[PDB]
Design a protein around this ligand. Structure first.
Ligand SMILES: *[C@@H]1O[C@H](CO[C@@H]2O[C@@H](C)[C@@H](O)[C@@H](O)[C@@H]2O)[C@@H](O[C@@H]2O[C@H](CO)[C@@H](O[C@@H]3O[C@H](CO[C@H]4O[C@H](CO)[C@@H](O)[C@H](O)[C@@H]4O)[C@@H](O)[C@H](O[C@H]4O[C@H](CO)[C@@H](O)[C@H](O)[C@@H]4O)[C@@H]3O)[C@H](O)[C@H]2NC(C)=O)[C@H](O)[C@H]1NC(C)=O
Ligand SMILES: CCCCCCCC/C=C\CCCCCCCC(=O)OC[C@H](COP(=O)(O)OCC[N+](C)(C)C)OC(=O)CCCCCCC/C=C\CCCCCCCC
Ligand SMILES: CCCCCCCC/C=C\CCCCCCCC(=O)OC[C@H](COP(=O)(O)OCC[N+](C)(C)C)OC(=O)CCCCCCC/C=C\CCCCCCCC
Ligand SMILES: CCCCCCCC/C=C\CCCCCCCC(=O)OC[C@H](COP(=O)(O)OCC[N+](C)(C)C)OC(=O)CCCCCCC/C=C\CCCCCCCC
Ligand SMILES: CCCCCCCC/C=C\CCCCCCCC(=O)OC[C@H](COP(=O)(O)OCC[N+](C)(C)C)OC(=O)CCCCCCC/C=C\CCCCCCCC
Ligand SMILES: CCCCCCCC/C=C\CCCCCCCC(=O)OC[C@H](COP(=O)(O)OCC[N+](C)(C)C)OC(=O)CCCCCCC/C=C\CCCCCCCC
Ligand SMILES: CCCCCCCC/C=C\CCCCCCCC(=O)OC[C@H](COP(=O)(O)OCC[N+](C)(C)C)OC(=O)CCCCCCC/C=C\CCCCCCCC
Ligand SMILES: CCCCCCCC/C=C\CCCCCCCC(=O)OC[C@H](COP(=O)(O)OCC[N+](C)(C)C)OC(=O)CCCCCCC/C=C\CCCCCCCC
Ligand SMILES: C[C@@H]1O[C@@H](O[C@H]2C[C@@H](O)[C@]3(CO)[C@H]4[C@H](O)C[C@]5(C)[C@@H](C6=CC(=O)OC6)CC[C@]5(O)[C@@H]4CC[C@]3(O)C2)[C@H](O)[C@H](O)[C@H]1O
Ligand SMILES: *[C@@H]1O[C@H](CO)[C@@H](O[C@@H]2O[C@H](CO)[C@@H](O)[C@H](O)[C@H]2NC(C)=O)[C@H](O)[C@H]1NC(C)=O
Ligand SMILES: CC(C)CCC[C@@H](C)[C@H]1CC[C@H]2[C@@H]3CC=C4C[C@@H](O)CC[C@]4(C)[C@H]3CC[C@]12C
Ligand SMILES: CC(C)CCC[C@@H](C)[C@H]1CC[C@H]2[C@@H]3CC=C4C[C@@H](O)CC[C@]4(C)[C@H]3CC[C@]12C
Ligand SMILES: CC(C)CCC[C@@H](C)[C@H]1CC[C@H]2[C@@H]3CC=C4C[C@@H](O)CC[C@]4(C)[C@H]3CC[C@]12C
Ligand SMILES: CC(C)CCC[C@@H](C)[C@H]1CC[C@H]2[C@@H]3CC=C4C[C@@H](O)CC[C@]4(C)[C@H]3CC[C@]12C
Ligand SMILES: [Mg+2]
Ligand code: NA
Ligand code: NA
Lengths: 294, 993, 40
């Protein structure tokens, strides 16, 4: 058994068959699998021919935009010591990676960048989603706009003396027009002051009623000095039709932060085409657990 | 419990005297034992009652069903799942509970299967318990000189015991004085006729001598006395029962097939696991992850639903058998019949009816045949001549037996008749075709009679003549044909009378040898009309002197009789021989009768010849002829005792029609073992206790239900509650049908294994988002798939199954490489490709093109990256991409169902085409409809994306697997075509399961 | 179209589920019919 079914010397068989048999079986499987691969490739090519290069057919799973930030938190927590420098390195590295894309050297010339209103403005339509006109043009977003969190003055961005920053960003969606709430009698408390129609407001607060007192002064930095996103940087025409496109950003400095205590800060954007979800904690809003232990 | 001392042939002290016997055990031949001494022995050795069988608590057999071979594999799978969960828990945070769910599911599956199988075997046990009817019995013992009837459990060795016709022999007695006492040794020794028990010794074999009574035997007619020689378990049938209980069980063929199947499944599972373990280690992953990968692949390569499917398949074939009155105690004993290739049968009680019946009759120089079948389904014998009427009057009058009171309900043949067997058969035949014998007897008053003398060997009697015109006297005598022939001078031909010239005397001699050679017992009936002038109506013929003319009588005709076989015995034997099953007769009866029954049932085909037949046809000694020219052989037990192992092997290797006669139960067991030693499956069919050691050691035992013994009924595996022998043919047919169906169902349940493992393999090698989730694999293996696999059992035959030769056990297996090459190699591959196609389509329509999917798993899984760029530049949060992945799992599961449609259709038939067989299986159609409805329900029902994580699909996706399904159908259709046109070609020795 | 192109991000999953359930129910019924067609 063990030895025979492996190699016999009378029938000159190996594993069970002769030399020509293993060849017949190998050749059959090679032809079969080759036909299988060719058919699968053809059925995938017809698919590639069914889709368009300038627009995703289905855009319903990304209707309510998200709200991400610059620091990379493992559990949405920012904990670092003001003494040990090797504690907030993972944060600064990320922050830097994000801001490193807004360098002025990258934004230069007439193509493809265009100078836009230094003050919030309305939408701008560069035509349809076609290839007739060449590569569209995107508005320039300068670093310096973010005043104390830019890595140009204090590279660390704040983490050095107990005053961290948080650069918030709205998820890029093709053909999405942001719409803010109107001045009618129904509007949250916060939003009343500085109702620039052209600005999408972003406002952070405390998850629990207690934590309010322990949170100090939320100082927002943005385009024009407002705490929002200018509508002029929309809509997004997609990578193919707008490479070298920069999305607005909003800096948030959490000055006067209580020391040695976990603070839960929830940031939230307001608007018509914006809706939150009890399951996805990043849809429209976001949570951060800051703890500047020193 | 020394088995060798129980395997030996019975010994005894028969060859002794009455003085030596009384001097060895101690007992007064005329006064018996004393009460004090009787009780001293009763307490010294034990009551005369067999030991009860070894009981069995219900939790023990429930634990037995919870284990086995398949259930053990599922048990190790659950253990492995919990081990991997413990690891993931101690090594990382947020451990996915997938493994724990899979483990509790496997454990529940094993428990449910055990409960179902146990319930079925318990059902059979209850219906089996409703047959043991044990009424207490008391014997007649003589102590201190007085007769007393005491319980059978109080008889000891040495006391005197008296028996009377109608009672049962309590223990093993040594006859000391008998008065025409006959005994029925059919259950123990298998002797069809009543052997007379005489105080004298006659044969060296204790089973052949007449001075020994046996346990469980009944005294037909007469009275006798005897000293209890053997008592309790030490009796003959006690040692036989103890030997039967002290034998092993074995291991059915279906179990061995399941074992080899698990062997192949584990081989390919551990191979794919160790290989992808070395590969994962060669790509960088850590040890902690590689171990989980190995366990995941091994656990994934295990058919969980195949256990319930196989159990239901076997149960389905068992209920039909129970509908035709064929009950199986176990569950796997339903397939052994189909794999049998050598059936060892018993004669008395199994091949025959064990009841004497009038077979042939002689009258008007012509042999006439009578119907000897239980239900009386045959040909009449021309009841229109006067000769027959005279014969009916002779037999109905010169007979002292009468039906037992209160039988007005049972049929004419199954009623109880008090008297000898010959007189009973005659009475039954007359009551069958001549109306009520009670009126035929009261119509003619019997005046003077005369019993059966040992000298006269004839029974005569005179009665009045019912003729209202003739007041003469009728005389009727019956006896041996030679004695009666020497007392006649006339012959009743067609009614008239004629002389007894040598012409009819020679025709009577040829008729005597014709009925005698048939193995039957023939008698002669004659009568005479006494002249009323020499013997008036008032003269009394006292039985003292010669008042009747012994000679010058009128012979009417001979009457033969023999025990006939059961109705469907010849047809069933022929059907078994047609299927290539070797029929070998094994019985402890006389060879002269065994050979005749063998030729009458088909064991010894007409035309074949034995060495003695050739020596008789040539008129030369037997030592000259060559034994190779004889196809059939009759092996005597006495000669079997002195035969080596090689001789028995040669006997079975050179003779096709073998008949073992005068074989003891131990020899029956030796024959069964001699048949197994070669390599063929054996099925033993019996009824008495002598078959118990043969039914146990055989691969499958078939015991009779009505005419069977309790010991052989408890030691057998299949019971024939109706005593119909055709059930054997039905069983051998079902055993094959369910085998080809098991093959089809196994290939069906194994084809899906590939499109359930390939996604994870491409997930680890290509780093793409997980294609097939775990709750979808569970919804497939334990959901939809169950109904179709169960339906595959209801498939009818393709060709004649009762025509092909028995399957070879050493070459034709149940799961060969030809199946693995199809399920794992060709169909499963196409199904996996279809699933991946639907996958890529779903991800391409939402924004993730195939070029950007390779290399995303690291960020696609990360829970803290809320900005994943797609092929178009959009940013997707974690939960949004997870929702898309879940929708891909739902569509993958639906694609699996779509390809399973064509897989179930190509699995319906193994060789034939669909346009030939036909879609007449309604269960399969219902399976397809339900399989689709369940998938639609699991996807569209609200609250499923929360409980099971399955999102709704868009009507355009459901059509991504259709081309693959039709292609599968076309490929298998052309496959099952070259096999038909080209028999024996490459496609057959490569893809023909 | 233009600014108010909100429909470009909506899908009537409700109606889809309703139809899919009606169809599933019908298939189940037909199945039962075929199964019992013969025992009456
Ligand atoms: C986008 O801009 C980034 C910053 O640009 C600078 O500021 C703007 C406003 C302009 O003035 C521009 O001209 C400036 O360069 C730019 O990143 C910068 O890249 C340079 C070149 O590598 C870096 O200089 C090097 O600094 C290291 C030490 O860095 C310390 O500080 C940083 C934080 O700033 C920490 O991350 C480090 O760990 C250190 O703690 C020097 O060791 C290194 O030495 C090299 O040069 C000297 C001569 O000067 C040689 O003798 C040596 O052999 C070395 O070859 C450099 O001096 C600069 O640190 C870095 N800035 C930051 C904040 O990281 C970024 O690359 C731009 N990206 C794009 C895509 O345009
Ligand atoms: C990410 C990528 C995805 C990867 C997915 C992989 C999915 C895995 C799919 C299938 C698993 C294949 C594993 C091997 C299966 C072999 C089947 C097997 O072992 O069945 C057992 C048979 C026994 O059969 P029996 O009982 O009838 O025997 C009766 C003998 N009596 C009667 C004479 C005594 O034993 C035999 O067949 C003898 C054993 C023959 C073993 C052949 C080994 C070939 C394996 C690989 C070859 C690769 C070479 C590639 C290079 C080609 C050159 C270009
Ligand atoms: C692009 C899409 C690709 C899809 C690929 C997957 C396809 C798989 C699904 C369906 C395949 C259908 C194949 C059709 C085969 C028809 C064969 C046929 O018709 O052979 C005729 C037979 C032979 O008769 P005979 O001569 O032996 O009779 C003798 C009578 N005497 C004895 C009285 C003389 O006649 C008979 O079988 C008797 C009549 C039986 C009628 C059966 C009708 C039902 C057929 C299919 C059911 C639908 C399942 C749908 C599943 C989806 C659920 C949502
Ligand atoms: C011949 C014999 C024929 C017999 C045929 C029997 C067929 C039976 C047919 C239908 C009965 C199925 C069971 C019905 C279930 C009703 C569930 C239901 O109405 O849920 C409504 C609510 C959803 O509310 P919402 O939209 O506000 O949630 C928003 C949640 N947000 C916003 C957080 C995402 O539910 C919730 O909340 C919680 C959801 C609870 C999950 C229950 C689902 C059960 C899971 C597995 C069982 C399925 C096994 C398959 C059995 C097959 C049998 C053939
Ligand atoms: C004859 C034809 C039969 C057809 C039937 C199909 C057979 C099905 C075969 C296998 C499927 C059973 C697999 C059981 C899956 C359990 C899943 C489970 O336990 O998930 C746990 C989830 C937790 O999820 P999370 O961590 O995301 O929560 C995060 C919550 N945060 C974030 C808000 C805090 O809790 C929840 O979903 C809570 C809701 C609990 C839902 C339990 C549903 C149980 C479903 C089936 C069990 C009964 C089947 C018996 C029928 C057998 C048929 C032979
Ligand atoms: C998306 C999924 C797509 C799947 C598509 C699969 C398509 C591929 C189908 C077939 C390709 C395999 C062809 C292999 C040909 C080389 C095989 C070979 O070297 O064979 C040699 C033998 C001749 O040796 P011998 O027997 O004389 O020597 C006797 C030697 N001793 C004793 C060992 C028997 O060849 C023979 O016997 C002749 C046997 C030839 C095999 C015929 C099998 C045809 C099966 C399917 C074709 C139908 C496709 C329909 C698809 C419709 C799509 C819409
Ligand atoms: C012998 C075996 C017999 C087996 C019979 C099984 C019974 C089949 C049972 C039902 C099938 C009919 C289904 C009809 C359902 C239509 C419902 C409907 O209103 O659905 C509309 C969708 C379009 O969805 P949308 O995404 O565009 O809009 C979404 C817009 N929102 C989401 C905003 C609302 O359309 C769809 O689902 C398309 C529905 C699929 C179209 C049926 C295709 C039939 C394919 C082959 C059959 C050919 C037979 C040829 C006859 C030969 C005779 C010899
Ligand atoms: C012998 C003859 C036998 C004949 C038997 C016939 C049986 C009856 C046959 C059909 C009955 C049809 C019932 C139709 C029910 C429609 C319910 C429905 O359309 O609900 C949809 C909405 C949920 O929409 P959503 O906004 O959450 O979507 C998610 C949106 N996102 C995720 C984007 C945020 O419902 C809700 O809100 C409220 C839902 C309340 C719970 C309804 C329970 C329905 C569950 C099972 C019934 C279906 C059984 C059908 C038979 C199948 C047999 C296998
Ligand atoms: C590399 C690795 O990938 C992820 O984990 C992977 C390993 C492990 O976690 C599991 C969950 O236990 C595996 C499990 O092992 C084996 C399966 C039960 C298996 C079977 C189906 C079946 O029927 O029988 C067996 C097919 C895949 C499977 O269904 C799951 C799928 C989710 C996954 O999560 C995937 C995590 O992201 C992890 O953090 C990262 O390190
Ligand atoms: C920042 O928070 C500090 C408290 O941590 C505030 O200063 C305190 O003011 C109270 C009076 O209300 C004094 O009793 C404390 O001694 C002060 N503590 C310190 C450390 O100064 C301060 O007013 C806050 N400033 C802002 C801008 O929010
Ligand atoms: C009936 C079966 C066996 C035929 C299978 C044919 C296979 C081999 C054919 C079908 C479709 C074909 C592909 C379809 C599309 C493209 C893109 C084109 O820019 C180059 C050729 C290429 C890459 C083809 C290569 C060959 C291909 C995959
Ligand atoms: C006879 C055989 C070889 C024909 C095979 C035809 C193949 C190429 C057909 C059959 C089904 C088709 C797919 C089915 C479903 C969809 C989804 C739809 O929203 C876009 C088209 C797309 C992606 C199709 C592409 C082409 C396709 C795969
Ligand atoms: C994922 C891809 C690339 C793996 C492809 C694996 C292919 C080549 C494997 C899968 C199943 C395998 C076959 C399955 C069954 C048999 C029968 C056996 O008695 C000899 C090996 C043989 C003939 C195998 C040859 C190689 C084979 C066809
Ligand atoms: C006998 C064979 C060939 C018939 C094949 C029938 C197939 C095509 C049927 C069976 C079930 C059907 C699907 C079941 C469910 C739905 C959801 C519903 O809301 C729209 C129709 C849709 C999308 C169906 C499309 C057609 C479909 C896939
Ligand atoms: Mg018998
Ligand atoms: Na599996
Ligand atoms: Na047995």
């Amino acid at each position: 058994g063990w030895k025979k079914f492996l190699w016999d010397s009378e029938k000159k068989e190996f594993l069970g068959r002769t030399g020509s048999s293993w060849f017949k079986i190998f050749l059959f499987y090679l032809i079969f699998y080759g036909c299988l691969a060719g058919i699968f490739i053809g059925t995938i090519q017809v698919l590639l021919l069914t889709l368009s290069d300038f627009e995703p057919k289905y855009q319903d799973r990304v209707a309510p935009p998200g709200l991400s930030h610059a620091p990379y938190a493992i559990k949405t927590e920012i904990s670092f010591s003001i003494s040990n420098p090797k504690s907030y390195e993972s944060f600064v590295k990320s922050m830097h990676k994000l801001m490193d894309l807004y360098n002025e050297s990258s934004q230069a010339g007439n193509s493809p960048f265009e100078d836009c209103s230094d003050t919030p403005a309305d939408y701008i339509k560069r035509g349809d989603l076609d290839d007739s006109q060449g590569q569209k043009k995107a508005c320039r977003f300068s670093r310096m706009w973010l005043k104390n969190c830019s890595g140009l003055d204090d590279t660390t961005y704040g983490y050095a003396e107990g005053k961290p920053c948080v650069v918030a960003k709205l998820n890029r969606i093709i053909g999405f027009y942001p719409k803010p709430l109107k001045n009618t009698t129904d509007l949250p408390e916060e939003l009343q002051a500085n109702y620039n129609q052209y600005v999408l407001p972003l406002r952070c607060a405390a998850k629990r009623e207690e934590d309010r007192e322990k949170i100090g002064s939320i100082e927002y930095f943005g385009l024009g000095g407002y705490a929002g996103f200018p509508l002029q940087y929309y809509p997004y025409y997609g990578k193919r039709l707008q490479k070298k496109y920069l999305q607005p950003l909003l800096a948030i400095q959490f000055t006067n932060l209580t020391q040695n205590m976990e603070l839960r800060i929830e940031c939230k954007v307001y608007g018509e085409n914006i809706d939150y979800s009890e399951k996805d904690r990043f849809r429209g809003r976001f949570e951060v657990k800051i703890e500047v232990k020193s | 419990d020394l088995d060798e001392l129980k395997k030996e042939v019975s010994m005894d002290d028969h060859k002794l005297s009455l003085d030596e016997l009384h001097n060895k055990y101690g007992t007064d031949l005329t006064r018996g034992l004393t009460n004090a001494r009787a009780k001293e022995i009763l307490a010294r050795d034990g009551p005369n009652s067999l030991t009860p069988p070894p009981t069995t608590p219900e939790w023990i057999k429930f634990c037995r069903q919870l284990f086995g071979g398949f259930s053990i594999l599922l048990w190790i799978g659950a253990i492995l799942c919990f081990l991997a969960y413990g690891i993931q828990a101690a090594t990382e945070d947020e451990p996915a509970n997938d493994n724990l769910y899979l483990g509790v599911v496997l454990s529940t599956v094993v428990i449910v299967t055990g409960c179902f199988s146990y319930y079925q075997e318990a059902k059979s046990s209850r219906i089996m318990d409703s047959f043991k009817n044990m009424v207490p019995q008391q014997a007649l013992v003589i102590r201190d000189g007085e007769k007393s009837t005491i319980n059978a459990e109080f008889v000891v060795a040495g006391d005197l015991v008296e028996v009377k016709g109608g009672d049962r022999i309590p223990a093993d007695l040594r006859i000391i004085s008998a008065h025409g006492c006959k005994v029925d040794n059919s259950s123990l020794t298998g002797e069809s006729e009543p052997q007379t028990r005489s105080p004298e010794f006659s044969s060296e074999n204790p089973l052949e001598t007449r001075n020994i009574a046996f346990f469980s035997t009944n005294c037909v007619e007469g009275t006798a006395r005897g000293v209890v020689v053997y008592t309790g378990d030490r009796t003959v049938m006690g040692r036989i029962a103890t030997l039967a209980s002290g034998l092993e069980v074995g291991r059915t063929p279906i179990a061995i097939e399941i074992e080899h199947f698990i062997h192949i499944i584990t081989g390919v599972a551990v191979f794919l696991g160790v290989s992808f373990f070395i590969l994962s280690l060669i790509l960088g992953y850590s040890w902690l992850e590689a171990v989980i990968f190995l366990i995941g692949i091994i656990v994934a390569n295990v058919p969980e639903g195949l256990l319930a499917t196989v159990t239901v398949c076997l149960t389905l074939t068992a209920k039909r058998m129970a509908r035709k009155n064929c009950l199986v105690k176990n569950l796997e004993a339903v397939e052994t019949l189909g794999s049998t290739s050598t059936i060892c049968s018993d004669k008395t009680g199994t091949l025959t009816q064990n009841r004497m019946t009038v077979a042939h009759m002689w009258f008007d120089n012509q042999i006439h045949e009578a119907d000897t079948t239980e239900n009386q389904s045959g040909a009449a014998f021309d009841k229109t001549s006067a000769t027959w009427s005279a014969l009916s009057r002779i037999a109905a009058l010169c007979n002292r037996a009468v039906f037992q009171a209160g039988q007005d309900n049972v049929p004419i043949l199954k009623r109880s008749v008090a008297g000898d067997a010959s007189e009973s058969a005659l009475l039954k035949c007359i009551e069958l075709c001549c109306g009520s014998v009670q009126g035929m007897r009261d119509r003619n008053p019997k005046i003077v009679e005369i019993p059966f003398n040992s000298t006269n060997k004839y029974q005569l009697s005179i009665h009045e003549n019912e003729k209202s015109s003739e007041s003469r006297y009728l005389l009727v005598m019956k006896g041996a044909p030679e004695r009666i022939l020497d007392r006649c001078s006339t012959i009743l031909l067609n009614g008239a009378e004629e002389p007894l010239k040598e012409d009819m005397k020679e025709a009577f001699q040829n008729a005597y040898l014709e009925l005698g050679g048939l193995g039957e017992r023939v008698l002669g009936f004659c009568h005479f009309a006494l002249p009323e002038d020499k013997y008036n109506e008032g003269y009394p013929f006292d039985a003292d002197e010669p008042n009747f003319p012994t000679t010058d009588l009128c012979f009417v005709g001979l009457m033969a009789m023999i025990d006939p076989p059961r109705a469907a015995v010849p047809d069933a034997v022929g059907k078994c021989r047609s299927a290539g099953i070797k029929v070998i007769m094994v019985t402890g009866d006389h060879p002269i009768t065994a050979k005749a029954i063998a030729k009458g049932v088909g064991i010894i085909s007409e035309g074949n010849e034995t060495i003695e037949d050739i020596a008789a046809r040539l008129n030369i000694p037997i030592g000259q002829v060559n034994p190779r020219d004889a196809k059939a052989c009759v092996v005597h037990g006495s000669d079997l005792k002195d035969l080596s192992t090689e001789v028995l092997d040669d006997i079975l290797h050179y003779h096709t029609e073998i008949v073992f006669a005068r074989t003891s139960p131990q020899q029956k067991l030796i024959i069964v073992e001699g048949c197994q030693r070669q390599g063929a499956i054996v099925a033993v069919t019996g009824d008495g206790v002598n078959d118990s050691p043969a039914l146990k050691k055989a691969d499958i035992g078939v015991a009779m239900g009505i005419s069977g013994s309790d010991v052989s009924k408890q030691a057998a595996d299949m019971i024939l509650l109706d005593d119909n022998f055709a059930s054997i043919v039905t069983g051998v047919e079902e055993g094959r049908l369910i085998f080809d169906n098991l093959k089809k169902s196994i290939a069906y349940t194994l084809t899906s294994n590939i499109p359930e493992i390939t996604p994870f393999l491409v997930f680890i090698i290509g780093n793409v988002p997980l294609p097939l989730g775990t709750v979808t694999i569970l919804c497939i293996d334990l959901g939809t798939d169950m109904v179709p696999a169960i339906s595959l059992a209801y498939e009818q035959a393709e060709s004649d199954i009762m025509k092909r030769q028995p399957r070879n056990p050493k070459t034709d297996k149940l799961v060969n490489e030809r199946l693995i090459s199809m399920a794992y190699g060709q169909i499963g591959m196409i199904q996996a490709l279809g699933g991946f196609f639907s996958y890529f389509v779903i991800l391409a329509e939402n924004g993730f093109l195939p070029m950007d999917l390779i290399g995303k798993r690291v960020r696609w899984d990360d829970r803290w990256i809320s900005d994943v760029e797609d092929s178009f530049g959009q940013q997707w949060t974690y939960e949004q991409r997870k929702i898309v992945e879940f929708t891909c799992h739902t569509s993958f599961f639906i694609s699996i169902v779509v390809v399973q449609w064509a897989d179930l259709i190509i699995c319906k038939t193994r060789r034939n085409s669909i346009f030939q067989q036909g879609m007449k299986n309604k269960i399969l159609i219902f399976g397809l409809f339900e399989e689709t409805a369940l998938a639609a329900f699991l996807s569209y029902c609200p609250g499923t994306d929360v409980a099971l994580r399955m999102y709704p699909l868009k009507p355009s996706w459901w059509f991504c697997a259709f081309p693959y399904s039709l292609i599968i159908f076309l490929y298998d259709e052309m496959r099952r075509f070259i096999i038909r046109r080209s028999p024996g070609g490459w496609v057959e020795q490569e893809t023909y399961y | 179209e233009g600014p108010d192109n909100d429909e470009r991000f909506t899908y009537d999953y409700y109606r889809l589920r309703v139809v899919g359930l009606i169809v599933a129910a019908v298939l189940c019924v037909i199945g039962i019919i075929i199964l019992l067609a013969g025992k009456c």
